[PDB]
């Protein structure tokens, strides 16, 4: 009954989005509202907590199948393509691994987008474009990079400078006051408000895909609610920062979709920029990992002996990359779109789906491996609640939401122009 090996990954996950999303809360703040805000926070952190323990039960589900024929996973790491293939189907497998690879796609080059700019506020003699030509180089360089374990280690200093960053934020806006005539409008346009809700989405989007099966053996009796313990510490870290800073400079963002634009300078800016750009650095070299899995799955020049060809594999993997950050260097309007054409499939739909496919059958309800939990105590309420999250995030999340990212995403482009020289730079 493994579930601390995929508690790990997807803290892992959490812990990079929250920081990835940090510095872009206020825009959509602005966009929405402060009531409107808060309340979306709440909503979409615990509909991903829920969604979250539908994947451990559906990955201790399929170990528990699989070790009754006989076959062990030693010196292995569970897939989570793997997983809806043992489970259900072929075509699951097909979609797991396109929205996957997608995805890790999509968070490449939003992670080199988000560099560019904090560089550039920490030094501004070189426009964003040049500082993208040289971030490109120092990421693209990172093609000769093993396989790296341990992610525990560094999740857990990822969120000790995302709590650092944050609660400077708060106090910083708190003590800086709000100038006279500054006005908040509130909910005016719908592409606005939308834009805004899937940037919120977008933030508690984020599941385990490779979960390592050797921390089987631990059972710990203080690990009941992990999921509602960590969404509780990243309400602490995001709703402070984001409402004192709406609150500090009023609708002036809708034109700064990074809140370090308009802090004022002095050292502890400059200590908050610093360890947001070396924590944004790193967790490249692990995200890329497993983009370059797949890719060397399908060329199949895997087992390579000389390391350079590896590299001449990869290329092809980073070009793309570098190639979209410099085209579309919308800092903001990236986060909707992603969210809105992706997140809602990939943490929030599919998982529902796959948890009320593999047991509809009343011979799998009797034989599962985990029964229902206290808080649900029968099956026809994990099924309300799951066509529930399906219903909403189908109507909401990727019906309005996507064409309102879109229209939102278009209107930049229409503004700005292909191959922008410096994004909203005064």
Not at 299 to 322: E, F, N
């Amino acid at each position: 009954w493994h579930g601390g090996s995929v508690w790990d990954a997807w803290f892992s996950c959490a812990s990079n989005q929250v920081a990835q999303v940090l510095l872009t809360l206020p825009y959509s703040f602005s966009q929405l509202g402060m009531l409107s805000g808060i309340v979306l926070q709440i909503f979409y952190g615990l509909l991903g907590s829920w969604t979250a323990y539908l994947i451990s039960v559906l990955y201790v589900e399929y170990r528990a199948r699989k070790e009754k024929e006989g076959k062990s996973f030693k010196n292995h790491v569970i897939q989570w393509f793997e997983v809806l293939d043992g489970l259900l189907g072929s075509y699951w497998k097909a979609l797991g691994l396109a929205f996957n690879c997608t995805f890790l796609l999509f968070g490449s080059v939003i992670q080199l987008i988000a560099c560019a700019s904090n560089i550039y506020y920490i030094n501004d003699h070189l426009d964003k474009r040049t500082w993208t030509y040289i971030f490109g180089a120092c990421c693209a360089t990172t093609v000769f990079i093993p396989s790296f374990h341990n992610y525990r280690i560094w999740s857990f200093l990822g969120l000790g400078m995302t709590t650092y960053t944050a609660w400077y934020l708060a106090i910083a806006s708190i003590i800086h006051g709000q100038a006279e005539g500054v006005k908040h409008s509130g909910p005016t346009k719908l592409v606005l408000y939308f834009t805004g809700a899937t940037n919120i989405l977008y933030t508690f989007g984020g599941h385990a895909v490779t979960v390592e099966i050797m921390h089987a053996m631990w059972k710990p009796q203080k690990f009941k609610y992990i999921y509602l313990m960590a969404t509780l510490y990243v309400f602490t870290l995001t709703i402070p920062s984001a409402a004192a800073v709406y609150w500090a400079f009023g609708d002036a963002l809708l034109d700064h979709s990074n809140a370090f634009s308009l802090m004022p300078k002095n050292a502890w800016r400059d200590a908050a920029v610093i360890l947001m750009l070396i924590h944004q650095f790193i967790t490249f070299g692990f995200a890329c990992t497993p983009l370059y899995f797949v890719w060397e799955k399908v060329i199949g020049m895997h087992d390579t002996k000389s390391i350079c060809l590896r590299a001449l594999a990869r290329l092809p993997v980073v070009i793309p990359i570098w190639f979209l950050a410099i085209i579309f260097p919308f800092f903001g309007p990236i986060n909707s779109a992603v969210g809105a054409l992706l997140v809602s499939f990939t943490v929030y739909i599919i998982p529902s789906l796959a948890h009320m496919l593999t047991y509809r059958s009343a011979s799998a309800r009797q034989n599962a491996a985990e029964k229902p939990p206290f808080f649900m105590p029968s099956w026809t309420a994990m099924y309300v609640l799951n066509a529930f999250v399906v219903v909403w995030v189908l109507i909401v999340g990727f019906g309005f939401g996507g064409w309102a990212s879109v229209t939102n995403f278009v209107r930049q482009v229409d503004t700005f122009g292909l191959f922008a020289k410096c994004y909203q730079c005064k």
